[PDB]
Design an enzyme around this catalytic site. Structure first.
Site, PDB file in Angstrom:
ATOM      1  N   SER A  64      12.763  -8.896  64.571  1.00 26.81           N
ATOM      2  CA  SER A  64      12.805  -7.505  64.138  1.00 26.81           C
ATOM      3  C   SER A  64      13.737  -7.369  62.938  1.00 26.81           C
ATOM      4  O   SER A  64      13.546  -8.031  61.924  1.00 26.81           O
ATOM      5  CB  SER A  64      13.294  -6.627  65.298  1.00 26.81           C
ATOM      6  OG  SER A  64      13.634  -5.327  64.855  1.00 26.81           O
ATOM      7  N   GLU A  91       2.579  -5.346  68.125  1.00 28.47           N
ATOM      8  CA  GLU A  91       3.854  -4.909  67.597  1.00 28.47           C
ATOM      9  C   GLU A  91       3.972  -3.397  67.696  1.00 28.47           C
ATOM     10  O   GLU A  91       4.973  -2.889  68.198  1.00 28.47           O
ATOM     11  CB  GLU A  91       4.006  -5.348  66.135  1.00 28.47           C
ATOM     12  CG  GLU A  91       3.961  -6.855  65.914  1.00 28.47           C
ATOM     13  CD  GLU A  91       5.266  -7.538  66.293  1.00 28.47           C
ATOM     14  OE1 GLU A  91       6.066  -6.926  67.036  1.00 28.47           O
ATOM     15  OE2 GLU A  91       5.490  -8.691  65.859  1.00 28.47           O
ATOM     16  N   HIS A 106       6.592  -5.611  71.129  1.00 32.43           N
ATOM     17  CA  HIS A 106       7.552  -5.977  70.103  1.00 32.43           C
ATOM     18  C   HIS A 106       8.823  -6.502  70.754  1.00 32.43           C
ATOM     19  O   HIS A 106       9.433  -5.824  71.575  1.00 32.43           O
ATOM     20  CB  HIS A 106       7.848  -4.741  69.249  1.00 32.43           C
ATOM     21  CG  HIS A 106       8.782  -4.984  68.101  1.00 32.43           C
ATOM     22  ND1 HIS A 106       8.534  -5.919  67.120  1.00 32.43           N
ATOM     23  CD2 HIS A 106       9.923  -4.351  67.736  1.00 32.43           C
ATOM     24  CE1 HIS A 106       9.479  -5.846  66.198  1.00 32.43           C
ATOM     25  NE2 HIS A 106      10.334  -4.903  66.547  1.00 32.43           N
TER      26      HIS A 106
END
Ligand SMILES: *[C@@H]1O[C@H](CO)[C@@H](O)[C@H](O)[C@H]1NC(C)=O
Ligand SMILES: *[C@@H]1O[C@H](CO)[C@@H](O)[C@H](O)[C@H]1NC(C)=O
Ligand SMILES: C[C@@H](c1cccc(O)c1)N(C)C
Length: 532
Positions: free
Chosen positions: A197, A324, A437
């Site tokens: 991330s 995601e 995610h």
């Protein structure tokens, strides 16, 4: 003693932790900078003054100040990310897991956590590096940095709050590893920085930032790249959001010094309480305070740097997950609920594309919709839902990364790309969110090994494959075993564009990861938005 190490900064007393019926040393909470408290708030990180005496590095440090998630109080799927340590502006520390017996010169891996640059803690459980350190025999270091306004408020021009300090905090940790990891058995010339991330985006940003290139050997980016639409902002925007933040706490806005002073007098939670009121648009996957393209940490626009090869050349190992987008729609888009299948209607679908592409004008919102809608079934709730899920994912993670990788490979010394698409069997989030995610993280840190966590035999297998790929890559510059009898991970080349799966099934190689939707996101929509 194995639990005693002498570093340029001073002596450090660690502790022996148990790992999968064995033991490894752990030096937790080592300081690598002076506490950015008081008038140092917003300022660049300062070197932690050396100390004499032994430093108790047996327990975790505080987590930086940050917005805690209360969307699902008690829900483990969302709090496993909240800080599990007393928050505190005094949070700049790093943790090192060391194999035992202590190595002499092994590969080192420094982990930079994610969190939209507004949250993140090295002390989380899925970030425990004992399993990796132990399993792959590597010195694992997880650093920390200032997130939120605390680490990213950007009044360009001022030296009190220049911005990007959070990234500076990171670099400072990287320097400390360069200078001292040798005393922990680590080979300072074989450090591999990897993040997920915001962490992955950070990694790419150190690859781009000249002042950082020299501090690490290889790089691994997970679900994120430096050029993501949410990873950076212009000095202007950053400045604007700074004033707005100030305006939110009724700050005198006559000068930067006037403004900065006011913000430094406010308690931490005061800045946090209004942090989200500074964004410029009602949007999904967008954070207030993030790295600004200042001209210093980033010589020029990330794109030109990418185009001119102005960046550290080496090998990189990156990838993304299948779903995601799911996580940000659940939290903001109208229609998604943690407890429902979240079937989305055309009305809500449209509202989603609005939040998803905040900068888009009408024609732009139209292009996207046209591109992600099955007109032969424009009213299928599952389709509308997944389509939206895909939009959020391609625009914010997959396509930006694919641009980066495509631009890098043209100058890099090796590129390996993975598409993680296995849903953990123990996931407590709704099935509709799929491969969420940040959920590849647990396999990277080998949590499927500890049985009490309830993973399936194959899942443990997967973890081990990943862990080895990562480690073997960190040590060599390739995830593959020199001479092996099992599946090669193709090298990604601008020609073949090969890449691989990462699930409990026999790995299979593929090509051109989501080209179709990424030619739209990376090449078309931009042109479209600019012409108009
Ligand atoms: C820090 O070290 C002391 C002794 O040096 C130890 O008793 C303590 O458990 C360690 N961490 C704590 C509990 O703060
Ligand atoms: C990496 O660099 C080495 C030496 O500079 C070169 O021999 C090798 O072909 C390069 N590999 C790639 C994939 O560029
Ligand atoms: C919220 C956050 C996140 C949520 C779950 C797992 C993560 O690694 C990061 N995004 C915004 C960066």
């Amino acid at each position: 003693s194995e639990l005693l190490v002498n570093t340029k900064s001073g002596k450090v007393m660690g502790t022996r932790v148990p790992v999968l019926s064995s033991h490894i040393s752990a030096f937790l909470g080592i300081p690598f900078a002076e506490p950015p408290v008081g008038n140092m708030r917003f300022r660049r990180p300062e070197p932690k003054k050396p100390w004499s005496g032994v430093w108790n590095a047996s327990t975790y440090p505080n987590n930086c100040q940050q917005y805690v998630d209360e969307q699902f109080p008690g829900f483990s799927g969302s709090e496993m990310w909240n800080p599990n340590r007393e928050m505190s502006e005094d949070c700049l520390y790093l943790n090192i897991w060391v194999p035992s017996p202590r190595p002499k010169s092994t590969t080192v891996m420094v982990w930079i956590y994610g969190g939209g640059f507004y949250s993140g803690s090295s002390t989380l459980d899925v970030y425990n590096g004992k399993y990796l350190a132990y399993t792959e025999e590597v010195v694992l270091v997880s650093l920390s940095y200032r997130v939120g306004a605390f680490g990213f408020l950007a009044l360009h021009g001022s030296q009190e709050a220049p911005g990007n300090v959070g990234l500076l905090d990171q670099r400072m940790a990287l320097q400390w590893v360069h200078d001292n990891i040798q005393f922990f058995g680590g080979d300072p010339k074989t450090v591999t920085i990897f993040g997920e991330s915001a962490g992955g985006a950070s990694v790419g940003m150190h690859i781009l930032s000249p002042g950082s290139r020299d501090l690490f050997r290889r790089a691994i980016l997970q679900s994120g790249s430096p050029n993501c639409p949410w990873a950076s902002v212009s000095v202007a925007e950053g400045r604007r959001r700074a004033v707005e933040l100030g305006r939110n706490l009724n700050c005198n806005l006559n000068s930067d010094e006037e403004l900065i002073h006011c913000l430094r007098e406010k308690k931490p939670q005061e800045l946090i309480d209004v942090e989200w009121n500074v964004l410029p648009f009602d949007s999904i996957f967008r954070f207030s305070f993030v790295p600004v393209i200042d001209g210093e940490f980033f010589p020029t626009s990330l794109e030109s740097m990418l185009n001119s090869g102005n960046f550290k050349k080496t090998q990189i190992l990156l990838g993304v997950n299948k779903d995601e987008g799911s996580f940000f729609l659940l939290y903001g888009a109208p229609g998604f609920s943690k407890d429902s299948e979240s079937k989305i209607s055309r009305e809500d679908f449209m509202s989603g594309v609005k939040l998803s592409v905040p900068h888009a004008n009408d024609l732009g919102l139209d292009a996207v919709t046209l591109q992600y809608t099955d007109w032969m079934d424009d009213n299928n709730g599952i389709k509308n839902r997944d389509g939206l899920d895909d939009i959020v994912g391609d625009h914010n993670v997959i396509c930006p990364l694919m641009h980066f990788v495509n631009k890098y490979t043209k100058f890099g010394n090796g590129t390996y790309l993975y598409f993680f698409n296995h849903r953990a069997s123990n996931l407590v989030w709704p099935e509709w969110m799929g491969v969420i995610h940040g959920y590849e993280i647990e396999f990277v840190f080998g949590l499927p090994l500890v049985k009490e966590l309830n993973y399936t035999a194959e899942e443990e297998a997967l973890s081990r494959r990943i862990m080895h790929y990562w480690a073997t890559f960190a040590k060599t510059g390739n995830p593959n075993e020199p001479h092996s009898q099992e599946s090669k991970w193709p090298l990604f080349t601008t020609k073949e564009q090969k890449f691989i799966d990462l699930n409990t099934e026999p790995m299979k190689v593929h090509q051109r990861l989501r080209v179709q939707m990424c030619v739209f996101w990376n090449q078309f929509l931009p042109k479209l938005l600019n012409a108009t």
